[PDB]
């Protein structure tokens, strides 16, 4: 297992993790907007 | 290679911190959602 193999696998882990963190943010941003709409309605 | 390694290391540390912040905030949002949904 070379140093380059380690770097590649770290990078791969990171890109996979970033997409999941983004998805979680999008799910939560929808939830906050739903709460904001509930508190803002007439 | 030293630069790549140090960039990668910074990134993995940052991802764990961003995750922890999300979990803390996800708890806060769930607490608010429960407040607004209770009978």
């Amino acid at each position, epitope marked *: *297992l070379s140093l380059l193999d*380690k770097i590649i696998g*770290a990078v791969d*882990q990171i890109q996979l993790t970033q997409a*999941q963190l983004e998805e979680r943010q999008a799910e939560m941003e929808g939830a906050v907007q739903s709460i904001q709409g509930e508190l803002s309605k007439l | 290679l030293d630069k790549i*390694i140090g960039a990668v*290391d910074q990134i993995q540390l940052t991802q764990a911190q961003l995750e922890e912040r999300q*979990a803390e905030m996800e708890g806060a949002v769930q607490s608010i959602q429960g407040e607004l949904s209770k009978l």
Partner: nanobody
Amino acid sequence: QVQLQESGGGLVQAGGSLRLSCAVSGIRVNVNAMYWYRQAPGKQRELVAIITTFGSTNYADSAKGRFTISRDNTKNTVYLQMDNLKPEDTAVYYCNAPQFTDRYWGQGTQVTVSS
């Protein structure tokens, strides 16, 4: 699949120490950052410690210098040394990689600390 086999928990006295192990298959621990979590009953899962691919570590504030995460690359195993344990550390402890926390969790290892 990825396999996570947690061990090393048990019943320990306050001020005691434990060393948890997670034996991993399907990913290399020397290529991937690896995380330890804990979950007390009815509470949210808390991140406890992380070790990066190149061996940097970070700890939750609740660890406050008591815990040490490490790994053995040949055994493909991650360890959590826990010193000066307190009743508040009672929880199920889980090991995972960040890319799989949405996907799979092992059985964990129960840690119970009594005074």
